Amino acid sequence: MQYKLILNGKTLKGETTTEAVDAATAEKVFKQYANDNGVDGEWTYDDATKTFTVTE
Amino acid sequence: MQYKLILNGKTLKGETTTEAVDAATAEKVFKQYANDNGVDGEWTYDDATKTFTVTE
Amino acid sequence: MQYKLILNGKTLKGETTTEAVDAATAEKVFKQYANDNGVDGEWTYDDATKTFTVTE
Amino acid sequence: MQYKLILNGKTLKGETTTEAVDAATAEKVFKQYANDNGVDGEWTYDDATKTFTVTE
Amino acid sequence: MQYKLILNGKTLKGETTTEAVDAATAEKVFKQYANDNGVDGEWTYDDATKTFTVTE
Numbered sequence: 001m002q003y004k005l006i007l008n009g010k011t012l013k014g015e016t017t018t019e020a021v022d023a024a025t026a027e028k029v030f031k032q033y034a035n036d037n038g039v040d041g042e043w044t045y046d047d048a049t050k051t052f053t054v055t056e
Numbered sequence: 057m058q059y060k061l062i063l064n065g066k067t068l069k070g071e072t073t074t075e076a077v078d079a080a081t082a083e084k085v086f087k088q089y090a091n092d093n094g095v096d097g098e099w100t101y102d103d104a105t106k107t108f109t110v111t112e
Numbered sequence: 113m114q115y116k117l118i119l120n121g122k123t124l125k126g127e128t129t130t131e132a133v134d135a136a137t138a139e140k141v142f143k144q145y146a147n148d149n150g151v152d153g154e155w156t157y158d159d160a161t162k163t164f165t166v167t168e
Numbered sequence: 169m170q171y172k173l174i175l176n177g178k179t180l181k182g183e184t185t186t187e188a189v190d191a192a193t194a195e196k197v198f199k200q201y202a203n204d205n206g207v208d209g210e211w212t213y214d215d216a217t218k219t220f221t222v223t224e
Numbered sequence: 225m226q227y228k229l230i231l232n233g234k235t236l237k238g239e240t241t242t243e244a245v246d247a248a249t250a251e252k253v254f255k256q257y258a259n260d261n262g263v264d265g266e267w268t269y270d271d272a273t274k275t276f277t278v279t280e
Contacts, residue, residue: 007100014100016064016111036062038105057196063268067247070268072279077199077211077222084113087133088159094272099133106196110133 003050005030009039010056023047030054061086061108065095079103086110115162117142121151122168135159142166171218173198177207178224191215198222229254229276233263247271254278 003026005016016033020026023045034040034054041056059082061072072089076082079101090096090110097112115138117128128145132138135157146152146166153168171194173184184201188194191213202208202222209224227250229240240257244250247269258264258278265280 009102009104011103012100012105012107014109014111015098016100016109037100037107037109038102057192057199065272067271068268070277070279071266072268073266077208078203079200080113080203081208084162087113088135091134091136093268093275093277094270096133096137103200 001050003030003052005033005052005054007037007039008053008055009037009041012037012039023050027052057106059086059101059106059108061089061110063093063095064109064111065093065097066112068093068095079106083108113162115142115157115164117145117164117166119149119151120165120167121149121153124149124151135162138162139164169218171198171220173220173222175205175207176221176223177205177209180205180207191218194218195220225274227254227274227276229257229278231261231263232277232279233261233265234280236261236263247274251276 002017002019003023007013007016018026018029030052039054039056041054043054045052058073058075059079063069063072074082074085086108095110095112097110099110101108114129114131115135119126130138130141142164151166151168153166155166157164170185170187171191175182184198186194186197198220207222207224209222211222213220226241226243227247231238242250242253254276263278263280265278267278269276
């Protein structure tokens with residue numbers, strides 16, 4: 001399945017996605033990716049819509 | 057300054073960079089370049105680290 | 113990035129803009145918008161200044 | 169150390185400064201700041217006097 | 225099929241191509257070739273158009 005990460009940071013904003021079997025494994029990319037992207041804030045995950053969002 | 061665009065598309069993946077005064081002028085190259093590259097998706101812009109990323 | 117459409121028709125004159133990754137996707141709004149606006153003429157697009165113009 | 173940016177634009181003129189370790193990091197503020205200020209032109213950087221100047 | 229590598233380095237610029245069944249096998253030549261050419265940077269691989277590009 002695929003999950004979608006929304007970029008909501010100081011200036012980082014747009015969308016992000018990944019293909020994974022598990023939600024927690026998908027976050028590994030997005031959370032680690034957030035460091036490479038700069039926006040690191042409070043995280044959340046909706047398993048009902050496979051959608052993640054990070055807000056700082 | 058320099059901004060970095062990450063390639064995250066169907067199969068287009070690697071890194072990209074450009075030297076510009078403005079972030080919006082830097083995107084003109086990357087967003088226009090994306091058409092020439094094939095990967096056209098949602099966009100975010102890190103002004104916090106000068107990093108862009110496109111996801112389709 | 114942003115493109116600018118100039119209105120040059122029979123009586124419809126002004127400026128128009130849109131935020132898009134591609135120039136061609138930006139035209140979809142402007143060209144389709146022109147029908148809703150009434151001014152439909154010869155089109156052109158400058159990718160060097162992200163500027164469109166329709167003349168009838 | 170500190171770098172100094174000179175404002176030489178259409179109507180925006182004055183002086184600017186910032187405290188940074190690197191020259192390229194100092195420009196991030198000045199070049200990004202220029203968008204917020206309106207004056208965006210050709211850039212230059214003297215590392216011998218830590219002085220930047222933007223001319224449009 | 226054939227893939228195309230674009231040269232975008234410090235001073236090395238041009239086009240490159242190779243005939244291969246797989247993309248990863250095609251890169252072996254281009255990546256290894258880049259060492260012989262001097263331009264070694266970040267890499268992307270467009271499989272969507274069969275086009276590679278290296279930026280340093």
